[PDB]
């Protein structure tokens, strides 16, 4: 039974991205080893960041929830931002093809990191738990919250973005930054379920999506 | 997952003869008695709804393992269901089972998993199949998993007896009598084997006699001409092991001069705790004009005058050599040919109350307590002061006032002796319980001292096993329809992303139509 | 390797510690609630393999290799054929790792001599001079130090706090260090065979002449570098080795020298041969 779920949960979390891979014409690129580049600057982007906060950031000793701690974390999170921005220029073609290499990337180096583990030893485990499904759900949600950043930092980084869309696109880089800080001080202040946790998450990073998607068709087509 | 302490049944072999449960590990799912296959199953089962037939079912159909959940208050439990359980624990020990059987305290989280498991068991069959797959999907398992390894023999178990002495006016050669209790608690589980009727009691008389007379034998005036010996025997309920060793130890040592020649008679004192019977167990029927029937005499004597409550009677067994185990601790004197009787309020040693883990201090009334010593110790003073020939009369009790019993020291003696098991495989040489009992008898005892018997090592008498106490961790499974319907979710939903990156077109091009309408509006 | 990645557990006083400093890293970072704090313990644990000192060897790794790549290249013609136009690389590290081979050797048997002489003869003023040995268990597996004599100032300071307590051992260390690779580095060439007027000779053998030069003008041409290159390189491999010991690189300055020096050096005769 235990290696039964864990293969479910293994399969939910990896098939979207190689989805994602195929359907998005990436294969045709053989865009396989730039991906495997963006996982690598995702890599060390990671350790920056972690190297970063250990050398300024003291742990807080109180016991309530750390809200400055959390709010520091989600302003790290802007190196994460950066490192798109960087694979996105060192990675040549058209927009759509950057931005995807960029997330498939990105996404799947943190699935690795971040999932794998977990799954491997938690969900072979006797007991079983609904958060294995859900971290495997949620890798799918992260994927497009990636995707959403990706072309975010893609749409401020056009040279021919006009002004008036350029304080959209903050505000979107702005909220998607800080959406994880968001999320969990609104799960601890109403003791959310895990399930409506990751609905909430759901919800908010398709709302992410679909404002992006709208900017970014605007965006497109003032140029067409 | 939710852990909580199991108690294993005994596993021991006496005379190469094997008993108990011989598997202490567990791997399998917790099922109630109600579910139709127990096989490679742990069956849950309350105390109150245990009945042997059920556990001979159960070992039947060769479950995984069993658990018998214990109500918190052995007072509380209604004593019928105690003394049916009572009759049936000398017949599960007797019956060697390979599965293991484990005893756990009630706890509401076991509670909560026991009647979630026994609504599982009973929804099987009262629903059509495909009910029957939806709910065995959304119901919780439970697996239940043993921490503790797998037993092991006890090689060098050792068993310690304590006595003590006080001599009389006149030397060591004085005759001498014995009194004799064994301290070990015996029942299914050794860790819940508290034992304080059996034998407690007759441990708490012998301390309350070794007072009294060591009180009786400071002062001169009041010193007998009677040597006194107080054994505290270990092993009683493993074929008075600690008995026996003592017995070779004295006799077969020529310096050991006590024993040899100047025994009066041996006293054993069990189960004297509770009951308004007394039954007085002989091999032999005394002799007219021995010692012993002196002593017989004077215990009818000043049952009926003094205690006319009491019901006195003698029982006589012959002793049976063939058999492994025998009867009363006197037995094992009387095949030495030392004068000895038992002294019990049970008719007989085969009753369930006398080797059972419901033996608990709340069994034992303090005031039946008190009345037996008063009547033990006024019969051995008068045997030992020869009263009745003296002229004093029956009905006046010689331990009034100064030498009156102390009932909040019995109360306290049994309270100390039932706070811990006393199971002989876990009474350790260093144990607390005998280095406390050496100090009390040392304190009105002289010459107090221990002897320590070993199973040997070619024909071990006895041996005990480890993994008596265990931790039991009940984890939380799902059933293996329930994955498979979560593939076939999990496919579905693969198919309807691979579906809409697919048509995202759609999406994309629905997008562009609605912001030109906006731009144009 | 086994000091990055150990999976062996040392039983620290407050704790089970895995050995390896990537290992602890993440188990500390799994089993603590701080993860910050876990982190900062990793990156400057005291007992204990750190990533601070894994980045130091790191960044000593690419350091050395940039500076093994430093080369004069002096341009030979093939005499007998036209147009054929090969460099003869004079490496800024002209005489290898031989120069710390030879130094470490020597540091190495006067380690040996001055230990046996002071377990041997206590309390003789030579024996005392060549060094006087001491167990320091501070907190750590028993680690005999020199705390006297020569071997005293040979001996690598562990640390820029022990420098800073004791500056004249750690200025003698240096200028010892230094002094000996450079001497080394110009006795290896004569002794070796690789003075310009040998590889002169092997280019003679090989037919290969430098353009408008004779084969004497070569020699003095070659002469002009390479005694300095292999002063000047052996310099700098000693500063290279100090700078790594005072940075704490994991392996020892001198290993990771070698290390990097002799993996290019095999990659080299890999080329060559394929």
Redesign the interface.
């Known amino acids: 039974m235990t290696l039964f779920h864990f293969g479910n949960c293994f399969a939910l979390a990896y098939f979207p991205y190689f989805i994602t891979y195929k359907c998005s014409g990436l294969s045709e690129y053989n865009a396989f080893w730039k991906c495997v580049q963006a996982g690598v600057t995702y890599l060390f982007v990671q350790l920056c960041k972690m190297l970063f906060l250990a050398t300024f950031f003291p742990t807080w000793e109180g016991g309530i929830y750390d809200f400055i701690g959390e709010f520091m974390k989600a302003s790290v999170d802007v190196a994460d931002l950066i490192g798109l921005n960087l694979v996105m220029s060192r990675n040549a073609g058209k927009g759509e093809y950057k931005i995807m290499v960029a997330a498939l990337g990105w996404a799947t180096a943190e699935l690795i990191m971040s999932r794998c583990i977990p799954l491997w030893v938690g969900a072979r485990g006797i007991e079983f738990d609904w958060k294995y499904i859900q971290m495997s759900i949620d890798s799918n949600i992260s994927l497009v919250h990636y995707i959403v950043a990706s072309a975010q930092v893609w749409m401020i980084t056009r040279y021919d973005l006009y002004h008036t869309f350029r304080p959209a696109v903050l505000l979107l880089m702005f909220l998607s930054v800080y959406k994880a800080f968001v999320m969990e001080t609104f799960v601890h202040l109403c003791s959310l379920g895990s399930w409506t946790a990751l609905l909430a998450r759901a919800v908010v990073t398709g709302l992410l999506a679909l404002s992006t998607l709208a900017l970014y068709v605007a965006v497109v087509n003032v140029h067409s | 997952?939710h852990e909580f302490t199991v108690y294993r049944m005994q596993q021991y072999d006496l005379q190469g003869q094997p008993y108990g449960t011989r598997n202490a590990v567990l791997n399998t799912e917790a099922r109630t008695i109600d579910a139709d296959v127990l096989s490679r199953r742990c069956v849950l089962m309350r105390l109150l709804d245990f009945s042997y037939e059920q556990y001979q079912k159960a070992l039947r159909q060769s479950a995984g393992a069993v658990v018998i959940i214990l109500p918190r208050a052995m007072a509380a439990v209604p004593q019928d269901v105690i003394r049916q359980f009572m009759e049936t624990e000398p017949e599960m020990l007797a019956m060697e089972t390979v599965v293991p059987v484990y005893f756990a305290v009630e706890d509401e989280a076991l509670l909560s998993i026991y009647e979630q498991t026994q609504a599982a068991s009973a929804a099987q069959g009262s629903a059509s199949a495909a009910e029957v797959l939806l709910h065995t999907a959304t119901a919780?398992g439970f697996?239940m998993?043993t921490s503790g390894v797998q037993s092991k023999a006890v090689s060098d178990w050792l068993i310690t007896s304590v006595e003590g002495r006080l001599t009389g006016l006149g030397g060591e050669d004085l005759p001498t009598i014995v009194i004799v209790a064994h301290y070990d608690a015996f029942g299914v589980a050794p860790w819940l084997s508290h034992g304080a009727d059996s034998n407690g009691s007759g441990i708490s008389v012998l301390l309350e006699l070794a007072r009294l007379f060591s009180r009786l034998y400071t002062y001169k005036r009041t010193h007998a001409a009677y040597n006194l010996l107080f054994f505290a025997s270990g092993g009683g309920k493993f074929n008075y092991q600690g008995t026996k060793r003592w017995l070779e130890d004295n006799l077969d040592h020529t310096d050991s001069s006590l024993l040899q020649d100047n025994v009066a008679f041996v006293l054993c004192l069990d189960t004297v705790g509770r009951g308004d019977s007394l039954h007085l167990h002989v091999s032999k029927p005394p002799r007219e004009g021995t010692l012993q029937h002196a002593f017989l005499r004077e215990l009818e004597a000043v049952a009926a005058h003094q205690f006319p409550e009491v019901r006195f009677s003698m029982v006589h067994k012959k002793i049976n050599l063939a058999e492994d185990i025998l009867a009363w601790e006197h037995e094992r004197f009387a095949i030495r040919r030392l004068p000895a009787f038992t002294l019990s309020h049970l008719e007989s040693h085969r009753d369930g109350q006398r080797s059972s883990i419901m033996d608990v201090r709340s069994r034992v009334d303090s005031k039946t307590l008190t009345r037996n010593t008063r009547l033990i110790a006024e019969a051995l003073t008068r045997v030992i002061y020869n009263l009745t020939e003296k002229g004093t009369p029956p009905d006046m009790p010689v331990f009034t006032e100064q030498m009156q019993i102390q009932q909040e020291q019995l109360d306290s003696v049994m309270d100390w002796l039932t706070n811990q098991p006393r199971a002989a495989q876990l009474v350790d040489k260093d144990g607390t319980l005998l280095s406390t009992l050496e100090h009390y008898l040392s304190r009105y005892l002289k010459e107090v001292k221990q002897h320590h018997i070993k199973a040997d090592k070619r024909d071990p008498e006895f041996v005990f096993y480890d993994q008596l106490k265990q931790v039991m961790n009940a984890?939380?499974?799902?059933?293996?329809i329930f994955?498979?319907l979560?593939?076939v979710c999990?496919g579905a939903?693969?198919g309807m992303?691979?579906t809409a990156?697919?048509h995202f077109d759609l999406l994309?091009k629905t997008?562009?139509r609605l912001?030109?309408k906006a731009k144009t509006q | 390797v086994w000091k990055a990645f150990s999976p062996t557990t040392v039983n620290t006083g407050r704790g089970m510690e895995f050995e390896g400093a990537i290992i602890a890293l993440f188990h500390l970072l799994a089993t603590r609630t701080d993860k910050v704090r876990a982190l900062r313990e990793a990156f400057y644990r005291q007992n204990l393999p750190n990533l601070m000192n894994l980045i130091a060897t790191i960044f000593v790794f690419a350091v050395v290799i940039y500076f093994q790549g430093f080369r004069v290249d002096l341009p030979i013609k093939s005499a007998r054929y036209r147009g054929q136009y090969n460099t003869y690389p004079i490496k800024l590290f002209y005489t290898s790792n031989i120069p710390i081979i030879l130094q470490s050797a020597l540091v190495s048997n006067l380690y040996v001599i001055s230990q046996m002489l002071s377990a041997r003869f206590s309390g003789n003023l030579l024996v005392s001079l060549l060094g006087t040995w001491s167990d320091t268990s501070s907190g750590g597996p028993a680690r005999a130090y020199p705390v006297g004599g020569l071997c005293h100032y040979l001996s690598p300071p562990e640390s820029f706090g022990s420098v800073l307590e004791d500056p004249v051992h750690a200025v003698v260390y240096i200028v010892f260090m230094l002094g000996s690779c450079a001497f080394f580095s110009k006795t290896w060439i004569e002794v070796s065979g690789s003075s310009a007027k040998d590889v002169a000779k092997q280019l003679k053998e090989q037919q290969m002449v430098m353009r408008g030069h004779r084969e004497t003008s070569m020699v003095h041409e070659l002469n002009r570098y390479i005694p300095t290159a292999a002063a000047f390189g052996g310099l700098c491999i000693g500063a290279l080795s100090v700078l790594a010991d005072f940075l704490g690189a994991i392996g020892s300055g001198t290993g990771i020298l070698l290390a990097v020096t002799i993996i290019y050096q095999y990659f080299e005769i890999f080329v060559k041969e394929q």
């Not at chain 2, 984890?475 to 293996?480: E, F, G, L, S, T």
């Open positions: 997952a919780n697996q998993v984890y939380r499974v799902k059933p293996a994955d498979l979560l593939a999990i939903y693969l992303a691979y990156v697919q994309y997008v562009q912001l030109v």
